[PDB]
Every structure is written in structure tokens, then in C-alpha cells.
Amino acid sequence: SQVRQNFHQDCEAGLNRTVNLKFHSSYVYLSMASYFNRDDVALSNFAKFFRERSEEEKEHAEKLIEYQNQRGGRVFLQSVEKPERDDWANGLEALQTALKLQKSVNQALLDLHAVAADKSDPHMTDFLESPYLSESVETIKKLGDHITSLKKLWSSHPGMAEYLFNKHTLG
Amino acid sequence: SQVRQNFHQDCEAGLNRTVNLKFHSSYVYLSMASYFNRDDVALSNFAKFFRERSEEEKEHAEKLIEYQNQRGGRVFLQSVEKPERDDWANGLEALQTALKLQKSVNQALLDLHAVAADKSDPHMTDFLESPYLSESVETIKKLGDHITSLKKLWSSHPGMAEYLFNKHTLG
Amino acid sequence: SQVRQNFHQDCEAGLNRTVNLKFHSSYVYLSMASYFNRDDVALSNFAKFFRERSEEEKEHAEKLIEYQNQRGGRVFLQSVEKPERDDWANGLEALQTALKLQKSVNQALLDLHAVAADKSDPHMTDFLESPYLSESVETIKKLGDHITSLKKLWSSHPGMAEYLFNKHTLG
Amino acid sequence: SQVRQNFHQDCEAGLNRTVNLKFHSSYVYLSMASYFNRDDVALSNFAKFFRERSEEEKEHAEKLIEYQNQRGGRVFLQSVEKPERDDWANGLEALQTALKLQKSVNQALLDLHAVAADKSDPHMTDFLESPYLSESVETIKKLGDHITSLKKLWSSHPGMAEYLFNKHTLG
């Protein structure tokens, strides 16, 4: 590529592997959103929350693809694996699963960053720092906060817990 | 009728029988609304919800009468039977009764549609599809959602359940 | 499901299979869009065109998932297979591939419709007719038009063809 | 300097050498702009494009001088060498020369960054990352895109190529 400069093969490959991870996360969130819209679950604000998380992960995936092209790397798309579950049990379990998902994606972004730093690519480290790394820790903090509040309500009455949280926190 | 064309006797008769069903549903909802305005029940938002359901069924009944005239059929009104109950027990029982009512009205609209299709009346099938059939499944989904949320709260404290739902969901 | 009524297993299954098809189409278009943003291809308006086609297919996939829930069916997501190619050759080949893709998706929607009609589900046939079937034939006509115009320019100079079309038709 | 802190001699020297490079680039672009305004070349939009590139490089040179002062370093200006050519042949050759120029300036910014990182100067690495390194890769991608589009048109008719590109891409 006539445009390529100081762009290592490993950074190019790590980038393609990270967009697949981002698409997989989006898919997981889509599944959660759909689960909460079920007539036998009916937690509209949980659904809404996961739907926006889904769109956000999709958006990240697309910006990474754009970054690949801007640096003169070549995009290679892989199949997107379906979510690990179709039934997400309840609002608390869904929230806890999301925290784990966010931590694994954050780790992947950290590893990619480490590769870019190792290859002396200041453009890529800068790109990954904001808003990717920033968004991750903010989302992780918010999810952690949510889990703490939902757990408190859960100890009393889980039935009432989800209803109140859906209305007062997620709404 | 100088206007009549491709309008079968069975579709004309099914139509008159369906408007009576619509008036009966409206009457049932009116009864529920009135029940929730009782000083010993006092759930203003449940009342409001059933009052609008009542007006909506009345509106459908009137549009079907108009359709009858537009096709050159003749309207024959029957007596409107009173609701099956005067006391609706509580908010959950009222909601569950409404779901059953909605399913029976939906079935009646499906049967009427089947007759129109059998008689090759594309104008009538189209008319019944939107907004009648559409409104039915939307209302059925909403009622199903409501019943799920109210049941959750009910398991903890039914007294608090109705109060909270009336305020946060129906208000 | 307390909400389910006149919803056949085959329609439920056909629906889950169609959302996967919609996600696969979106993915194919995303690949095409990314291909045209390559520095060695550089056709920004072709990219833009395929990017919106991608978002539109994604949107359809999501509305079908919502329809599934509204009818009381259960959503089952499958892995999304990657596009058949990573390099799309040129603007004309990309356009011709899209026409084939659109015809296969249209066929799938027709088959699903036929199942709904066979099972006497007027709500589903109505839902599939607009805007799904409508959007398909409009897109197919537009793509056919585009291919005809691009082919005309191609016979003279393909290099100039893509440049002019990207500017005057897609821009 | 009473203001100096954690500012290495090598970073100070690299900075003075980089502003001279920036002034030289600006001068090169000024020459290209002037060349395209010649009555026997007459490509007003190519001229305009290179004129803004010139002003942008000049602006960078000035901000680096300001950075030098802010850190307590001392500015030392050197003579600005004239461009390597006075005649730039044509629009494609001019574009290709600019890509090479941009790559060499990008490399110089990367080397300077490496020195700042080696000397543990986080203020300078941060300063160089945005908008310097960012602007470079964006300009390099845009130039690469332009060269690809112009080459396509060139294969057919170079005379028509420059005229069309000047109007549709640069205008």
C-alpha cells in the first residue's frame, strides 16, 4: 500500500481480530436486549440499555475497520460466533455477564495497545487510548455500580428488585 | 344496493356479529374502569387504562358499521349483553380477564378474515388487516407484558404491587 | 407464551432463519463498503452506498426479532457467516453481486410469506408485505438501473466509468 | 531558563530541526500552487489544494516554535532551502511528489517522538501525537486516495483527467 508507514503486521492482525471481538460483543448485547423484550420477562429499560450497548460495540467495530484502511492495512472479516446463551436468566445475571464481557474486551484492547507500543506506533496507541480504553473503564464502572444497586434490592425481593431498578435506574 | 359489488352475505353477516362483539368488549372495559374508581379500590390509573380500552373498542365498532354502509351492506344492531361480572376482584385478575377478552376478539377477527378470503374479497381482508388485526396483537403483547410485571410484584406484596404498578407503569 | 395466538412453529422457525440471512447480507455490504474505502480503490460514494445498504439490512434483522417477540415466538440467534469474498474486484462486479444478493433475500422473504399464507396467518403476511417485500423490489430496480448505467460507461473506459458514476450517480 | 523542566537538549534540538523541515514543506507546496496558476497549466483547484497544504505546514512550523518557548527551549532558525523543482510536470506527478514529501515529514515526526519517549518526556509525546501525527496520516490517506483516482482517469486520457479531477474532486 502506497499509504502504509510504520504499520506492523502484528498491529494489522491484532486489529482484524479485535473488530471480530467487537462484533461478537454487539451480538451478545443484541441477544440480551431481545431477551428482555420477551412477554414473560418484560423489562423494557433493561432491553433499551443492552440495545444501546450493542450499537456502541458495533460502532467501535466499524471505526476500527476504518482505522485499518487509513493506515493502509487490509481488512479481513471472520464469521461472528453466536452468543453463548439464548436465555439470560434475569436482570442481575445479565448485568454480571456484561461486566465479564466488558473486562475481556478491555483486556483485548490492552493487549493490542501493548503490541502497538512494542512496535513503536504512537499513532495507534493514541488512537486506542481515546475513546476505546476510556469508554471501557467508564462502562465497567457504570456496570459495577448497577450490579451493586441491583444486588441490594435483590436481597429483599428479587421480583420487586427488577421492576424498581428498570424504572428508577434504567429509566 | 346500487353500490354493492363483490360483497358476500356471509361477510355482511359476520360484520354485524363483530360490531356487537366490539360493543360488548367496550362495555366490559367500562365496567372495569368504573370498578377501579370505587373508593374501596382507588386505582385511578388502572381505571384510566380500561377507560381508553373501552373507547378504542367503541371506535372499532363504529368504523365497522361505517364499512358495512360503504360496501352497501345493511346494519342490524343487536342488544349488548352486560359484562359477566360487576366486581373485578383486583388489578391482576382484571388484567388477566382482559387478555382473555382480547384473544377471543382477535379470534373473531381472524375468523371473519378467513371468510372474506374464502369469498375472494380483497377489499375486506385488507380492511381487517390494518388496523384491526395489527391493534389486536399489539394490545395482546402489552397486556402480556403488564401481567408479567404485576405478577412479579405480587409475589412480594400484592397490596404494594397494585399501588406501585398503578403509579409507575400505568401512570 | 400467554401472548401466542395463531402463530405456527414453521413461521416462528422461518423467522429466525430470515434474521440470520438479514445479518449475513448486512455483513456482506459492510465488506463492500470497507473495500471501496481502500486507498487503492478510493470510491467514497460506492462505499457510502453499500454502508447504508448494510445498515438497512441490519435494521430489518432487528425488526424481525421484534416481530418474533410480539407474536410470542422465541428468538434463536445463529453465527453469522463471513462474506464470500474480501476483495470485490470493482464497482460493476460489486453492483452485480448485490443484485444477486438482493434477489436471494427477496426469494427468502417470498418463501416465508408463502408459509405464513399456507398457515393462514394474515398478521404475518401483512407484516412481510410492507415494508419488506416493497423495499426489496425497489432496491432491485435501483440496482438494475445502476448496473445498466455503469455498463454503458464501462464499454468506453472503465477507469473513467467508476470515477464518473461515483460522482454523478452515487454522489 | 526558569521555566525549563524535564526538557532534554536533544528534544530541543530536534524541535528546531523539525520547524525548518516544516517551513521547507510549506515552501515546496507554495511552489506547486504557483505552478498550477500558470496560464499554460491552468488548474485552479490543484493550485488551491497545494496553497492550503502550504499554509497548514506553515501553521505547524509556528506552533512548534511556540512549543519551544513554552518549554523554555531556545529557538534557532536556519535558512529555508528552495524547492527541488520549479516546474512540477503535471497534476499526477505533483500529487505523487506530495505523498513522498508527507511520508518524509511523518518519519521526521516519528523520530522526534521516539527521542521524546526515550527521554521520558510525556508532555512532548502527547503534544506530537495530536494533531501532528494525526494530521499526517490523514493527509497521507487523502493523497493516496487522490493518486488512485487520478491514475484511473489518466489511463484513458490524461488531458481530460486533470480537467475532470480539478473540477470534481478538488472543486
Side-chain angles (χ1 to χ4, degrees), chain B residues 81-111:
Chain B
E81 178 64 48
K82 69 194 219 67
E84 299 70 22
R85 300 161 65 176
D86 287 283
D87 187 283
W88 301 97
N90 56 244
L92 181 62
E93 189 154 328
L95 244 32
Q96 292 177 320
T97 298
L99 180 65
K100 295 174 188 296
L101 175 66
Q102 292 293 155
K103 305 273 271 300
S104 58
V105 173
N106 190 41
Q107 190 56 67
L109 291 173
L110 288 174
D111 292 346

mmCIF file of all heavy atoms in Angstrom, chain B residues 81-111:
data_model
loop_
_atom_site.group_PDB
_atom_site.id
_atom_site.type_symbol
_atom_site.label_atom_id
_atom_site.label_comp_id
_atom_site.label_asym_id
_atom_site.label_seq_id
_atom_site.Cartn_x
_atom_site.Cartn_y
_atom_site.Cartn_z
ATOM 1 N N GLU B 81 -75.097 -7.394 25.540
ATOM 2 C CA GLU B 81 -75.116 -8.123 26.793
ATOM 3 C C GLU B 81 -74.196 -7.469 27.820
ATOM 4 O O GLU B 81 -73.087 -7.026 27.494
ATOM 5 C CB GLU B 81 -74.702 -9.583 26.554
ATOM 6 C CG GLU B 81 -74.644 -10.452 27.813
ATOM 7 C CD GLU B 81 -75.994 -10.625 28.499
ATOM 8 O OE1 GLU B 81 -76.993 -10.943 27.813
ATOM 9 O OE2 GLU B 81 -76.048 -10.452 29.730
ATOM 10 N N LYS B 82 -74.659 -7.433 29.064
ATOM 11 C CA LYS B 82 -73.899 -6.843 30.148
ATOM 12 C C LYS B 82 -72.659 -7.675 30.464
ATOM 13 O O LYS B 82 -72.554 -8.847 30.077
ATOM 14 C CB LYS B 82 -74.781 -6.725 31.388
ATOM 15 C CG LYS B 82 -75.119 -8.060 32.001
ATOM 16 C CD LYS B 82 -76.237 -7.927 32.988
ATOM 17 C CE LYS B 82 -75.995 -8.794 34.185
ATOM 18 N NZ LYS B 82 -74.807 -8.279 34.928
ATOM 19 N N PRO B 83 -71.675 -7.063 31.133
ATOM 20 C CA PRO B 83 -70.460 -7.802 31.473
ATOM 21 C C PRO B 83 -70.783 -8.992 32.376
ATOM 22 O O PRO B 83 -71.780 -9.000 33.096
ATOM 23 C CB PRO B 83 -69.610 -6.753 32.192
ATOM 24 C CG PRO B 83 -70.062 -5.452 31.551
ATOM 25 C CD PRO B 83 -71.558 -5.642 31.516
ATOM 26 N N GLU B 84 -69.899 -9.977 32.350
ATOM 27 C CA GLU B 84 -70.056 -11.197 33.125
ATOM 28 C C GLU B 84 -69.916 -10.977 34.633
ATOM 29 O O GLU B 84 -70.397 -11.787 35.424
ATOM 30 C CB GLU B 84 -69.050 -12.248 32.647
ATOM 31 C CG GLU B 84 -69.204 -12.666 31.173
ATOM 32 C CD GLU B 84 -68.806 -11.576 30.154
ATOM 33 O OE1 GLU B 84 -68.040 -10.644 30.496
ATOM 34 O OE2 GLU B 84 -69.250 -11.670 28.989
ATOM 35 N N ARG B 85 -69.246 -9.898 35.030
ATOM 36 C CA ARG B 85 -69.059 -9.586 36.445
ATOM 37 C C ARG B 85 -69.232 -8.098 36.686
ATOM 38 O O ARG B 85 -69.142 -7.293 35.757
ATOM 39 C CB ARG B 85 -67.653 -9.986 36.899
ATOM 40 C CG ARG B 85 -67.349 -11.454 36.738
ATOM 41 C CD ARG B 85 -65.860 -11.711 36.748
ATOM 42 N NE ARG B 85 -65.253 -11.393 38.036
ATOM 43 C CZ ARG B 85 -63.971 -11.606 38.336
ATOM 44 N NH1 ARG B 85 -63.144 -12.137 37.435
ATOM 45 N NH2 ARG B 85 -63.514 -11.309 39.551
ATOM 46 N N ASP B 86 -69.506 -7.746 37.939
ATOM 47 C CA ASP B 86 -69.646 -6.349 38.349
ATOM 48 C C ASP B 86 -68.465 -5.997 39.257
ATOM 49 O O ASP B 86 -68.083 -4.836 39.377
ATOM 50 C CB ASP B 86 -70.965 -6.117 39.098
ATOM 51 C CG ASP B 86 -72.180 -6.148 38.175
ATOM 52 O OD1 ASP B 86 -72.416 -5.136 37.449
ATOM 53 O OD2 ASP B 86 -72.892 -7.184 38.181
ATOM 54 N N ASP B 87 -67.890 -7.014 39.889
ATOM 55 C CA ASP B 87 -66.752 -6.848 40.785
ATOM 56 C C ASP B 87 -65.608 -7.562 40.071
ATOM 57 O O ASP B 87 -65.738 -8.723 39.704
ATOM 58 C CB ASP B 87 -67.064 -7.529 42.118
ATOM 59 C CG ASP B 87 -66.007 -7.274 43.178
ATOM 60 O OD1 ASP B 87 -64.925 -7.902 43.116
ATOM 61 O OD2 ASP B 87 -66.277 -6.468 44.099
ATOM 62 N N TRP B 88 -64.488 -6.878 39.878
ATOM 63 C CA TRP B 88 -63.369 -7.478 39.159
ATOM 64 C C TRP B 88 -62.198 -7.964 40.005
ATOM 65 O O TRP B 88 -61.093 -8.175 39.498
ATOM 66 C CB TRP B 88 -62.922 -6.548 38.027
ATOM 67 C CG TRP B 88 -64.040 -6.295 37.064
ATOM 68 C CD1 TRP B 88 -64.879 -5.217 37.048
ATOM 69 C CD2 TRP B 88 -64.473 -7.156 36.004
ATOM 70 N NE1 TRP B 88 -65.807 -5.354 36.047
ATOM 71 C CE2 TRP B 88 -65.582 -6.536 35.388
ATOM 72 C CE3 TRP B 88 -64.036 -8.394 35.516
ATOM 73 C CZ2 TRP B 88 -66.262 -7.112 34.302
ATOM 74 C CZ3 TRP B 88 -64.712 -8.967 34.439
ATOM 75 C CH2 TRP B 88 -65.814 -8.321 33.845
ATOM 76 N N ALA B 89 -62.472 -8.150 41.293
ATOM 77 C CA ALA B 89 -61.511 -8.662 42.263
ATOM 78 C C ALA B 89 -60.290 -7.788 42.543
ATOM 79 O O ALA B 89 -60.173 -7.212 43.626
ATOM 80 C CB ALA B 89 -61.085 -10.067 41.867
ATOM 81 N N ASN B 90 -59.381 -7.695 41.577
ATOM 82 C CA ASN B 90 -58.177 -6.896 41.743
ATOM 83 C C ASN B 90 -57.534 -6.581 40.403
ATOM 84 O O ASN B 90 -57.975 -7.075 39.367
ATOM 85 C CB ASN B 90 -57.172 -7.595 42.684
ATOM 86 C CG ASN B 90 -56.794 -8.994 42.221
ATOM 87 O OD1 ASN B 90 -57.084 -9.977 42.889
ATOM 88 N ND2 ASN B 90 -56.124 -9.086 41.088
ATOM 89 N N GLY B 91 -56.472 -5.779 40.446
ATOM 90 C CA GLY B 91 -55.752 -5.371 39.253
ATOM 91 C C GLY B 91 -55.185 -6.494 38.408
ATOM 92 O O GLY B 91 -55.192 -6.401 37.183
ATOM 93 N N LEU B 92 -54.681 -7.547 39.046
ATOM 94 C CA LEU B 92 -54.121 -8.678 38.306
ATOM 95 C C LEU B 92 -55.209 -9.512 37.617
ATOM 96 O O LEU B 92 -55.081 -9.874 36.447
ATOM 97 C CB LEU B 92 -53.268 -9.563 39.224
ATOM 98 C CG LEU B 92 -52.600 -10.768 38.554
ATOM 99 C CD1 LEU B 92 -51.621 -10.324 37.478
ATOM 100 C CD2 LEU B 92 -51.898 -11.584 39.603
ATOM 101 N N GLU B 93 -56.298 -9.765 38.332
ATOM 102 C CA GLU B 93 -57.399 -10.541 37.791
ATOM 103 C C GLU B 93 -58.050 -9.780 36.644
ATOM 104 O O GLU B 93 -58.422 -10.373 35.633
ATOM 105 C CB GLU B 93 -58.416 -10.858 38.887
ATOM 106 C CG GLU B 93 -59.497 -11.853 38.464
ATOM 107 C CD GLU B 93 -60.091 -12.626 39.636
ATOM 108 O OE1 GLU B 93 -59.362 -12.885 40.624
ATOM 109 O OE2 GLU B 93 -61.285 -12.990 39.562
ATOM 110 N N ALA B 94 -58.157 -8.462 36.790
ATOM 111 C CA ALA B 94 -58.741 -7.619 35.755
ATOM 112 C C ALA B 94 -57.889 -7.688 34.486
ATOM 113 O O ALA B 94 -58.416 -7.835 33.379
ATOM 114 C CB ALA B 94 -58.841 -6.198 36.242
ATOM 115 N N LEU B 95 -56.573 -7.608 34.659
ATOM 116 C CA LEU B 95 -55.613 -7.669 33.556
ATOM 117 C C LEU B 95 -55.676 -9.019 32.834
ATOM 118 O O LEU B 95 -55.655 -9.072 31.604
ATOM 119 C CB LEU B 95 -54.206 -7.432 34.097
ATOM 120 C CG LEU B 95 -53.429 -6.192 33.645
ATOM 121 C CD1 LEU B 95 -54.344 -5.023 33.377
ATOM 122 C CD2 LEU B 95 -52.395 -5.838 34.690
ATOM 123 N N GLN B 96 -55.746 -10.103 33.604
ATOM 124 C CA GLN B 96 -55.824 -11.449 33.042
ATOM 125 C C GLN B 96 -57.137 -11.671 32.283
ATOM 126 O O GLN B 96 -57.164 -12.356 31.257
ATOM 127 C CB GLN B 96 -55.646 -12.496 34.139
ATOM 128 C CG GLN B 96 -54.250 -12.511 34.707
ATOM 129 C CD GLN B 96 -54.082 -13.492 35.844
ATOM 130 O OE1 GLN B 96 -54.963 -13.643 36.693
ATOM 131 N NE2 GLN B 96 -52.932 -14.149 35.885
ATOM 132 N N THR B 97 -58.223 -11.099 32.793
ATOM 133 C CA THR B 97 -59.516 -11.209 32.130
ATOM 134 C C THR B 97 -59.450 -10.476 30.773
ATOM 135 O O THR B 97 -59.938 -10.979 29.760
ATOM 136 C CB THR B 97 -60.638 -10.614 33.009
ATOM 137 O OG1 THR B 97 -60.725 -11.349 34.235
ATOM 138 C CG2 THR B 97 -61.971 -10.676 32.293
ATOM 139 N N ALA B 98 -58.819 -9.302 30.762
ATOM 140 C CA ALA B 98 -58.664 -8.506 29.549
ATOM 141 C C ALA B 98 -57.861 -9.258 28.480
ATOM 142 O O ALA B 98 -58.167 -9.164 27.288
ATOM 143 C CB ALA B 98 -57.997 -7.163 29.877
ATOM 144 N N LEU B 99 -56.834 -9.994 28.896
ATOM 145 C CA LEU B 99 -56.029 -10.756 27.945
ATOM 146 C C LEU B 99 -56.912 -11.808 27.258
ATOM 147 O O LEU B 99 -56.842 -11.992 26.038
ATOM 148 C CB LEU B 99 -54.837 -11.425 28.636
ATOM 149 C CG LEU B 99 -53.921 -12.252 27.716
ATOM 150 C CD1 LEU B 99 -53.241 -11.349 26.701
ATOM 151 C CD2 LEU B 99 -52.873 -12.984 28.535
ATOM 152 N N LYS B 100 -57.736 -12.492 28.047
ATOM 153 C CA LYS B 100 -58.653 -13.499 27.509
ATOM 154 C C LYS B 100 -59.647 -12.825 26.574
ATOM 155 O O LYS B 100 -59.959 -13.339 25.502
ATOM 156 C CB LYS B 100 -59.441 -14.181 28.627
ATOM 157 C CG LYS B 100 -58.629 -15.007 29.592
ATOM 158 C CD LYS B 100 -59.538 -15.491 30.719
ATOM 159 C CE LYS B 100 -58.759 -16.177 31.838
ATOM 160 N NZ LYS B 100 -58.082 -17.431 31.383
ATOM 161 N N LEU B 101 -60.177 -11.685 26.997
ATOM 162 C CA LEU B 101 -61.128 -10.968 26.167
ATOM 163 C C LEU B 101 -60.463 -10.616 24.838
ATOM 164 O O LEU B 101 -61.012 -10.891 23.781
ATOM 165 C CB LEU B 101 -61.621 -9.699 26.867
ATOM 166 C CG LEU B 101 -62.541 -8.765 26.062
ATOM 167 C CD1 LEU B 101 -63.880 -9.453 25.760
ATOM 168 C CD2 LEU B 101 -62.771 -7.482 26.826
ATOM 169 N N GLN B 102 -59.257 -10.059 24.893
ATOM 170 C CA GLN B 102 -58.545 -9.674 23.675
ATOM 171 C C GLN B 102 -58.264 -10.849 22.739
ATOM 172 O O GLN B 102 -58.329 -10.700 21.516
ATOM 173 C CB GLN B 102 -57.249 -8.932 24.003
ATOM 174 C CG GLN B 102 -57.447 -7.553 24.633
ATOM 175 C CD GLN B 102 -58.086 -6.507 23.716
ATOM 176 O OE1 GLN B 102 -58.692 -5.564 24.200
ATOM 177 N NE2 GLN B 102 -57.927 -6.650 22.406
ATOM 178 N N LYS B 103 -57.969 -12.013 23.305
ATOM 179 C CA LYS B 103 -57.697 -13.196 22.496
ATOM 180 C C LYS B 103 -58.969 -13.665 21.791
ATOM 181 O O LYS B 103 -58.921 -14.057 20.623
ATOM 182 C CB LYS B 103 -57.127 -14.322 23.355
ATOM 183 C CG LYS B 103 -55.889 -13.928 24.136
ATOM 184 C CD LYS B 103 -54.621 -14.118 23.348
ATOM 185 C CE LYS B 103 -54.057 -15.519 23.543
ATOM 186 N NZ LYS B 103 -53.733 -15.794 24.974
ATOM 187 N N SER B 104 -60.110 -13.590 22.478
ATOM 188 C CA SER B 104 -61.370 -14.016 21.869
ATOM 189 C C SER B 104 -61.808 -13.054 20.768
ATOM 190 O O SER B 104 -62.331 -13.484 19.744
ATOM 191 C CB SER B 104 -62.476 -14.204 22.915
ATOM 192 O OG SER B 104 -62.696 -13.021 23.651
ATOM 193 N N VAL B 105 -61.553 -11.762 20.951
ATOM 194 C CA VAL B 105 -61.909 -10.783 19.929
ATOM 195 C C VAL B 105 -60.969 -10.944 18.734
ATOM 196 O O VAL B 105 -61.395 -10.845 17.586
ATOM 197 C CB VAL B 105 -61.849 -9.326 20.450
ATOM 198 C CG1 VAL B 105 -62.070 -8.358 19.296
ATOM 199 C CG2 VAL B 105 -62.924 -9.100 21.510
ATOM 200 N N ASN B 106 -59.696 -11.223 19.009
ATOM 201 C CA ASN B 106 -58.713 -11.428 17.948
ATOM 202 C C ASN B 106 -59.137 -12.642 17.103
ATOM 203 O O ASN B 106 -59.095 -12.606 15.877
ATOM 204 C CB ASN B 106 -57.319 -11.664 18.543
ATOM 205 C CG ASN B 106 -56.227 -11.650 17.488
ATOM 206 O OD1 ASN B 106 -56.247 -10.833 16.573
ATOM 207 N ND2 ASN B 106 -55.271 -12.551 17.612
ATOM 208 N N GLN B 107 -59.574 -13.702 17.773
ATOM 209 C CA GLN B 107 -60.015 -14.910 17.098
ATOM 210 C C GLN B 107 -61.202 -14.615 16.200
ATOM 211 O O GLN B 107 -61.285 -15.118 15.075
ATOM 212 C CB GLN B 107 -60.413 -15.967 18.116
ATOM 213 C CG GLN B 107 -60.645 -17.322 17.497
ATOM 214 C CD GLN B 107 -59.440 -17.800 16.721
ATOM 215 O OE1 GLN B 107 -58.383 -18.073 17.295
ATOM 216 N NE2 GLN B 107 -59.580 -17.877 15.408
ATOM 217 N N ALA B 108 -62.131 -13.810 16.704
ATOM 218 C CA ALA B 108 -63.307 -13.450 15.929
ATOM 219 C C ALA B 108 -62.899 -12.678 14.674
ATOM 220 O O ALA B 108 -63.454 -12.901 13.600
ATOM 221 C CB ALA B 108 -64.278 -12.638 16.778
ATOM 222 N N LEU B 109 -61.906 -11.802 14.798
ATOM 223 C CA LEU B 109 -61.433 -11.025 13.654
ATOM 224 C C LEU B 109 -60.719 -11.931 12.648
ATOM 225 O O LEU B 109 -60.774 -11.694 11.441
ATOM 226 C CB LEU B 109 -60.514 -9.881 14.108
ATOM 227 C CG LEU B 109 -61.187 -8.743 14.882
ATOM 228 C CD1 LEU B 109 -60.149 -7.785 15.423
ATOM 229 C CD2 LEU B 109 -62.173 -8.018 14.001
ATOM 230 N N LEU B 110 -60.049 -12.967 13.150
ATOM 231 C CA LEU B 110 -59.346 -13.917 12.292
ATOM 232 C C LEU B 110 -60.357 -14.744 11.516
ATOM 233 O O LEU B 110 -60.190 -14.973 10.320
ATOM 234 C CB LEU B 110 -58.446 -14.841 13.113
ATOM 235 C CG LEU B 110 -57.184 -14.220 13.704
ATOM 236 C CD1 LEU B 110 -56.494 -15.238 14.600
ATOM 237 C CD2 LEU B 110 -56.251 -13.766 12.589
ATOM 238 N N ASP B 111 -61.411 -15.185 12.198
ATOM 239 C CA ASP B 111 -62.453 -15.976 11.554
ATOM 240 C C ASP B 111 -63.136 -15.160 10.471
ATOM 241 O O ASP B 111 -63.375 -15.664 9.376
ATOM 242 C CB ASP B 111 -63.500 -16.456 12.568
ATOM 243 C CG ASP B 111 -62.948 -17.477 13.559
ATOM 244 O OD1 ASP B 111 -61.847 -18.034 13.335
ATOM 245 O OD2 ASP B 111 -63.628 -17.725 14.574
#
